[PDB]
Design a protein around this motif. Structure first.
Motif, PDB file in Angstrom:
ATOM      1  N   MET A 746       0.821  -1.212   0.000  1.00 40.53           N
ATOM      2  CA  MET A 746       0.000   0.000   0.000  1.00 40.53           C
ATOM      3  C   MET A 746       0.863   1.273   0.000  1.00 40.53           C
ATOM      4  N   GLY A 747       2.192   1.104   0.035  1.00 33.94           N
ATOM      5  CA  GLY A 747       3.152   2.197  -0.152  1.00 33.94           C
ATOM      6  C   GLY A 747       3.600   2.841   1.146  1.00 33.94           C
ATOM      7  N   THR A 748       3.520   2.095   2.244  1.00 32.62           N
ATOM      8  CA  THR A 748       3.794   2.615   3.590  1.00 32.62           C
ATOM      9  C   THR A 748       4.547   1.546   4.396  1.00 32.62           C
ATOM     10  N   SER A 749       5.303   1.963   5.404  1.00 30.24           N
ATOM     11  CA  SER A 749       5.966   1.010   6.290  1.00 30.24           C
ATOM     12  C   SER A 749       6.040   1.557   7.707  1.00 30.24           C
ATOM     13  N   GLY A 750       4.971   1.332   8.469  1.00 33.06           N
ATOM     14  CA  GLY A 750       4.927   1.716   9.874  1.00 33.06           C
ATOM     15  C   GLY A 750       4.834   3.218  10.075  1.00 33.06           C
ATOM     16  N   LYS A 751       3.603   3.712  10.124  1.00 38.25           N
ATOM     17  CA  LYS A 751       3.324   5.120  10.441  1.00 38.25           C
ATOM     18  C   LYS A 751       3.882   6.151   9.428  1.00 38.25           C
ATOM     19  N   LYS A 752       3.368   6.062   8.194  1.00 38.35           N
ATOM     20  CA  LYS A 752       3.372   7.160   7.203  1.00 38.35           C
ATOM     21  C   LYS A 752       2.042   7.093   6.399  1.00 38.35           C
ATOM     22  N   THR A 753       2.026   7.543   5.133  1.00 39.01           N
ATOM     23  CA  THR A 753       0.832   7.469   4.246  1.00 39.01           C
ATOM     24  C   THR A 753       1.251   7.429   2.753  1.00 39.01           C
ATOM     25  N   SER A 754       0.314   7.254   1.820  1.00 38.07           N
ATOM     26  CA  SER A 754       0.685   6.882   0.435  1.00 38.07           C
ATOM     27  C   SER A 754      -0.507   6.768  -0.544  1.00 38.07           C
ATOM     28  N   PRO A 755      -0.257   6.928  -1.874  1.00 41.79           N
ATOM     29  CA  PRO A 755      -1.326   6.948  -2.894  1.00 41.79           C
ATOM     30  C   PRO A 755      -2.375   5.848  -2.715  1.00 41.79           C
ATOM     31  N   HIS A 756      -1.926   4.594  -2.684  1.00 47.43           N
ATOM     32  CA  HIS A 756      -2.848   3.454  -2.624  1.00 47.43           C
ATOM     33  C   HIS A 756      -3.508   3.268  -1.258  1.00 47.43           C
ATOM     34  N   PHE A 757      -2.833   3.674  -0.184  1.00 43.00           N
ATOM     35  CA  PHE A 757      -3.384   3.573   1.182  1.00 43.00           C
ATOM     36  C   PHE A 757      -4.522   4.562   1.488  1.00 43.00           C
ATOM     37  N   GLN A 758      -4.403   5.786   0.967  1.00 46.02           N
ATOM     38  CA  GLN A 758      -5.486   6.781   1.014  1.00 46.02           C
ATOM     39  C   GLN A 758      -6.727   6.121   0.419  1.00 46.02           C
ATOM     40  N   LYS A 759      -6.505   5.519  -0.744  1.00 45.64           N
ATOM     41  CA  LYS A 759      -7.494   4.716  -1.461  1.00 45.64           C
ATOM     42  C   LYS A 759      -8.037   3.545  -0.621  1.00 45.64           C
ATOM     43  N   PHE A 760      -7.146   2.819   0.047  1.00 39.98           N
ATOM     44  CA  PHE A 760      -7.536   1.709   0.912  1.00 39.98           C
ATOM     45  C   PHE A 760      -8.486   2.144   2.034  1.00 39.98           C
ATOM     46  N   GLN A 761      -8.118   3.193   2.771  1.00 37.95           N
ATOM     47  CA  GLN A 761      -8.990   3.708   3.828  1.00 37.95           C
ATOM     48  C   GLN A 761     -10.243   4.321   3.223  1.00 37.95           C
ATOM     49  N   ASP A 762     -10.091   4.910   2.034  1.00 36.47           N
ATOM     50  CA  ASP A 762     -11.230   5.455   1.277  1.00 36.47           C
ATOM     51  C   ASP A 762     -12.228   4.313   1.039  1.00 36.47           C
ATOM     52  N   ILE A 763     -11.800   3.290   0.298  1.00 33.06           N
ATOM     53  CA  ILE A 763     -12.627   2.108   0.009  1.00 33.06           C
ATOM     54  C   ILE A 763     -13.134   1.502   1.301  1.00 33.06           C
ATOM     55  N   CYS A 764     -12.240   1.103   2.196  1.00 36.61           N
ATOM     56  CA  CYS A 764     -12.672   0.582   3.497  1.00 36.61           C
ATOM     57  C   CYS A 764     -13.908   1.270   4.043  1.00 36.61           C
ATOM     58  N   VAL A 765     -13.820   2.578   4.208  1.00 37.00           N
ATOM     59  CA  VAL A 765     -14.885   3.341   4.850  1.00 37.00           C
ATOM     60  C   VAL A 765     -16.153   3.413   3.994  1.00 37.00           C
ATOM     61  N   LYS A 766     -16.010   3.490   2.666  1.00 35.06           N
ATOM     62  CA  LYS A 766     -17.168   3.367   1.773  1.00 35.06           C
ATOM     63  C   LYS A 766     -17.822   2.043   2.123  1.00 35.06           C
ATOM     64  N   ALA A 767     -17.046   0.970   1.956  1.00 32.88           N
ATOM     65  CA  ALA A 767     -17.524  -0.375   2.192  1.00 32.88           C
ATOM     66  C   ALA A 767     -18.216  -0.490   3.565  1.00 32.88           C
ATOM     67  N   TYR A 768     -17.679   0.197   4.580  1.00 33.20           N
ATOM     68  CA  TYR A 768     -18.218   0.093   5.940  1.00 33.20           C
ATOM     69  C   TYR A 768     -19.562   0.732   6.034  1.00 33.20           C
ATOM     70  N   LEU A 769     -19.629   2.026   5.760  1.00 31.68           N
ATOM     71  CA  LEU A 769     -20.884   2.754   5.968  1.00 31.68           C
ATOM     72  C   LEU A 769     -21.957   2.208   5.055  1.00 31.68           C
ATOM     73  N   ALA A 770     -21.552   1.689   3.889  1.00 33.74           N
ATOM     74  CA  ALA A 770     -22.456   0.983   2.976  1.00 33.74           C
ATOM     75  C   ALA A 770     -23.129  -0.222   3.663  1.00 33.74           C
ATOM     76  N   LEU A 771     -22.406  -1.024   4.446  1.00 32.84           N
ATOM     77  CA  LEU A 771     -23.063  -2.149   5.158  1.00 32.84           C
ATOM     78  C   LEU A 771     -23.944  -1.653   6.250  1.00 32.84           C
ATOM     79  N   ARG A 772     -23.596  -0.507   6.831  1.00 32.70           N
ATOM     80  CA  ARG A 772     -24.401   0.012   7.927  1.00 32.70           C
ATOM     81  C   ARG A 772     -25.818   0.362   7.411  1.00 32.70           C
ATOM     82  N   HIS A 773     -25.916   0.663   6.112  1.00 32.85           N
ATOM     83  CA  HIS A 773     -27.199   0.918   5.473  1.00 32.85           C
ATOM     84  C   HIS A 773     -27.999  -0.358   5.376  1.00 32.85           C
ATOM     85  N   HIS A 774     -27.449  -1.472   5.835  1.00 35.51           N
ATOM     86  CA  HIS A 774     -28.190  -2.719   5.878  1.00 35.51           C
ATOM     87  C   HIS A 774     -27.927  -3.413   7.199  1.00 35.51           C
ATOM     88  N   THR A 775     -27.815  -2.592   8.222  1.00 31.45           N
ATOM     89  CA  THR A 775     -27.531  -3.081   9.534  1.00 31.45           C
ATOM     90  C   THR A 775     -28.494  -4.160   9.989  1.00 31.45           C
TER      91      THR A 775
END
Ligand SMILES: COc1cc(-c2ccc3nc(NC(C)=O)sc3c2)cnc1OC
Length: 843
Positions: A746-775
């Protein structure tokens, strides 16, 4: 009848239970139900179109999602067609029908009616359906693959042939006479009494106990237990639950109102289930077959027939609150009286129904009565858009009423097979909560399965799984299954017959191998020799030519690739078996690879997979794709099943074991290289990095929500091409597995940030709140999953994990935050609890 008795044997042997047997019954409910169902079978048999039934075109009305439109940059799609090493590609409009496409093919060529099969599969592209909406197609496009159809003739319906068929005001009370066993458990003189409960879907109504007496092989009270409920006030599907303490040693139930609306009468010698050492095996009407070992209990009955002004402001809010609240939130008495008194308001909100119908004094004649008139004016419910979560809620263990349940089942009728399949398993499980054998729900599955070979296929396995594993509910299921088989029509009755021989043959072998390397981590030479020799023994005169792959019924497996078969290196001893594709029209020399395992309860595994699919499809509803890989897995018998091998994938563990394979260091850069070495073109590589960032995200969220997120390296796998996926879910914490080896990709190694990781947390959180809509949907499927899938569980704390996890009663900020933290734990720890597996080897 006589030739009609072989057929019966055939059935039973296809079923795994003899439903003509009568020794473990104290009335006819099953026989009756076996009769009850002839009509609805015949009814559905009769009204099914031969040509569409025989081709079972697998299809969806759902819109095609954004991410797959994106994949067509020309509003046109290529379809390779074939006739015998003679082929041509055809550009075709996403809205084209098959027959249409046939027009423009006949056109192209020559200068009667055949059909479009998928090369290698038992899958046809038929019916007034636009190609965009055939499943196989959507699937091809997901995977950036071509589409290879062969032209052949439709399958003669004659082969689907179905066989010819030729078919008071008194208070209530009960005499506890006594109880018996033969042999006694712990032995030192303890003390014992009987608790008789009057239940209605785990609502208990009245309850009585006996004076206790010295636990001996025979105990004889001869008492009347006079309950305060009135005979008349009893409601259908009220269970007489009888339980034995000292604490709880045994239980057993008797429907107080028989399928014929008859108050139940007379002598009964009941054999009782012992405790393991809440759940749906508790609810059953079945008696314990094992007469020789079970505790039993004699009893007696002889007690005949039976069969708006303006609301205030602040209370409307009290109500709306209650209503708009998770399924597990329990209702205060004050709540319940509110729902009831304002029942006519409450009826305008479909989300109420569950809560409302569990604010009913089902122990009162006059109230149920009203409740029924309350069901009378169903305008708003009838009309409402189907809410599966809602519908489901009303078929769990909390609802015994025949007509409450039935409106839920109404709602389902409006499901297309597409979705029938997503929920099929859960719905089958939900039969366990039906008071009676014959139920609307049971009838509906019966229908939907007989309509559509896909559903029927999966219905069969699902019912066979249970029948073969549970004594509590095999009887009822077996009655349903027989019903299905009778209508499925010989085509399939062969196919299943085929399929059943093989997995019987194979399980045979599977177990004989656990014998030979006891635990001993290693698998002796001798072991593989013998595997090889036996499978040769099998093939050479006994195995079928070929057979449908039960987890993927369009796949006709042929002969075994013995060479590639083996026993896995387990503490268990599963089988790595591989078969040739019996279809010669198939594009590959790739094999069908199936694992056979004994010693895990796969029904759990099955359940989870099916939720995963449900999730993937929720995410479909926001044009999101997370590349989950819920490989096929199917239970077949006691602690034993089969499992799809996913081609070209290894084990996060092994990718460490390679370079180092230490007793257990751990390295971070290693993962990424694995990919390089399996990426012939850097650009492809980036695709792995792409696929991974999703699959990782996907599994990150899901796994957390189910709280099956702290797992070992060994039980996570990844494809050469980037698709990560967990396995084996029968098997300080960490919320989920986010090792630093992952993060280096994801382009990081222990406490930094990076192109694909921004995306990872982006997707993660989309995916999360999306399931909450079907709690509620998840809660209810989980809650049930636990009540039907597991051992024993707390009907609070076990379930109540998942509401804290979906961050119930929160706005989307609080939550997204909540989740983000759950990532930052995995970087506090990195390797920590991963490391920790090994260590406890001695703790
Ligand atoms: C050990 O048995 C299990 C195995 C799996 C499982 C699932 C998929 C899978 N795919 C594999 N692919 C390769 C190439 O090794 S290896 C593999 C193993 C999933 N669950 C299990 O337990 C129920």
């Amino acid at each position: 009848s006589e030739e009609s008795q072989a057929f019966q044997r055939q059935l039973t042997a296809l079923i795994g239970y003899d439903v003509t047997d009568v020794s473990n019954v104290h009335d006819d409910e099953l026989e009756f139900t076996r009769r009850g169902l002839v009509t609805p079978r015949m009814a559905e048999v009769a009204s099914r179109d031969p040509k569409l039934y025989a081709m079972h075109p697998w299809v969806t009305s759902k819109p095609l999602p954004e991410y797959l439109w994106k994949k067509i940059a020309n509003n046109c799609i290529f379809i390779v067609i074939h006739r015998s090493t003679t082929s041509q590609t055809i550009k075709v409009s996403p809205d084209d029908t098959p027959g249409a496409i046939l027009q423009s093919f006949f056109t192209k060529m020559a200068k009667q009616d055949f059909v479009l099969r998928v090369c290698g599969r038992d899958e046809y592209l038929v019916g007034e359906t636009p190609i965009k909406n055939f499943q196989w197609v959507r699937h091809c496009l997901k995977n950036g693959e071509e589409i290879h159809v062969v032209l052949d003739t439709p399958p003669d319906p004659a082969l689907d042939e179905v066989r010819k068929e030729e078919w008071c005001d008194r208070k209530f009370r009960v005499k506890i006479r006594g109880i018996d066993i033969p042999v006694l458990p712990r032995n030192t003189d303890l003390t014992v009494f009987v608790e008789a409960n009057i239940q209605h879907g785990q609502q208990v109504l009245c309850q009585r106990r006996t004076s206790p007496k010295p636990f001996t092989e025979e105990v004889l009270w001869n008492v009347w237990l006079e309950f305060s409920i009135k005979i008349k006030d009893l409601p259908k599907g009220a269970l007489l639950n009888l339980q034995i303490y000292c604490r709880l040693l045994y239980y057993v139930n008797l429907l107080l109102i028989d399928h014929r609306f008859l108050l139940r009468r007379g002598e009964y010698v009941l054999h009782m289930w012992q405790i393991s050492g809440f759940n749906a095996d508790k609810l059953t009407s079945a008696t314990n077959p094992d007469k020789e070992n079970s505790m039993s209990i004699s009893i007696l009955l002889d007690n005949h027939p039976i069969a708006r002004a303006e609301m205030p402001n602040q209370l409307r809010k009290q109500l709306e609150a209650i209503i708009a609240t998770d399924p597990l939130n329990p209702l205060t008495a004050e709540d319940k009286e509110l729902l009831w008194h304002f029942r006519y308001e409450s009826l305008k909100h479909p989300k109420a129904y569950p809560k409302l119908f569990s604010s009913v004094k089902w122990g009162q004649q006059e109230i149920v009565a009203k409740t029924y008139q309350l069901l009378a004016r169903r305008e708003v419910w009838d009309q409402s858009a189907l809410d599966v979560g809602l519908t489901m809620q009303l078929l769990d263990c909390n609802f015994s009423d025949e007509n409450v349940r039935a409106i839920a089942v109404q709602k389902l009728e409006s499901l297309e097979d597409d979705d029938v399949l997503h929920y099929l398993l859960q719905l089958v499980q939900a039969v366990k909560f039906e008071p009676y054998h014959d139920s609307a729900l049971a009838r509906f599955l019966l229908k939907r399965g007989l309509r559509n070979k896909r559903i029927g296929h999966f219905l069969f396995w699902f019912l066979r799984s249970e029948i073969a594993q549970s004594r509590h509910y095999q009887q009822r299921f077996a009655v349903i299954l027989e019903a299905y088989l009778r209508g499925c029509g010989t085509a399939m009755l062969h196919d299943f017959t085929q399929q059943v021989q093989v997995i019987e043959m194979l399980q045979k072998v599977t177990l004989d191998i656990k014998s030979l390397s006891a635990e001993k981590y290693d698998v002796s030479s001798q072991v593989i020799s013998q595997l090889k020799q036996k499978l040769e023994n099998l093939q050479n005169s006994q195995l079928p030519e070929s057979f449908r792959v039960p987890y993927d019924p369009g796949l006709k497996a042929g002969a075994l690739a013995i060479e590639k078969c083996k026993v896995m290196a387990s503490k268990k001893k599963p089988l790595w078996l591989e078969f040739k594709c019996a279809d010669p029209t198939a594009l590959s020399n790739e094999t069908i690879g199936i694992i056979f395992k004994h010693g895990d309860d796969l029904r759990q595994d099955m359940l989870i997979l099916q939720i995963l699919r449900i999730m993937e499809s929720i995410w479909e509803t926001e044009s999101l794709d997370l590349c989950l890989l819920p490989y096929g897995c199917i239970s077949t018998g006691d602690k034993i099943g089969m499992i799809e091998i996913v081609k070209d994938a290894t084990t996060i563990a092994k990718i460490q074991q390679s370079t180092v394979g230490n007793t257990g260091a751990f390295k971070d850069e290693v993962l990424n290289h694995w990919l390089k070495e399996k990426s012939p073109t850097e650009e492809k590589f980036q695709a792995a990095v792409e696929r991974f960032v999703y699959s990782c995200a996907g599994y990150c969220v899901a796994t957390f929500v189910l709280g099956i997120g702290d797992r070992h390296n060994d039980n996570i796998m990844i494809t050469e091409t980037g698709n990560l996926f967990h396995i084996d879910f029968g098997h300080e914490r960490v919320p989920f597995v986010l090792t630093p080896d992952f993060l280096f990709v994801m382009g990081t190694s222990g406490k930094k940030t990076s192109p694909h990781f921004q995306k990872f947390q982006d997707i993660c959180v989309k995916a999360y709140l999306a399931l909450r809509h079907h709690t509620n949907l998840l809660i209810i499927l989980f809650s049930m999953m636990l009540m039907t899938g597991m051992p024993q569980l707390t009907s609070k704390e076990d379930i109540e994990y998942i509401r804290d996890a979906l961050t119930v009663g929160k706005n989307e900020e609080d939550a997204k935050k909540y989740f983000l933290d759950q990532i930052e734990v995995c970087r506090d720890k990195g390797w920590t609890v991963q490391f920790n597996w090994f260590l406890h080897l001695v703790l």
